[PDB]
Design a protein around this ligand. Structure first.
Ligand SMILES: [Ag+]
Ligand SMILES: [Ag+]
Ligand SMILES: [Ag+]
Ligand SMILES: [Ag+]
Ligand SMILES: [Ag+]
Ligand SMILES: [Ag+]
Ligand SMILES: [Ag+]
Length: 40
């Protein structure tokens, strides 16, 4: 759960919605839609 990064999801929810680009532990590799169970 390491989210000490800049939200680097290749989705549209992270690219724009800054509500989840705050502290998401997405291992700066998340590049799939059904691999983004992120909500923070
Ligand atoms: Ag993210
Ligand atoms: Ag995302
Ligand atoms: Ag995000
Ligand atoms: Ag997100
Ligand atoms: Ag995330
Ligand atoms: Ag993603
Ligand atoms: Ag993600």
């Amino acid at each position: 759960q390491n989210e000490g990064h800049e939200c680097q999801c290749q989705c549209g929810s992270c690219k724009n919605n800054e509500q989840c680009q705050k502290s998401c532990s997405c291992p700066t590799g998340c590049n799939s839609d059904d691999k983004c169970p992120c909500g923070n």
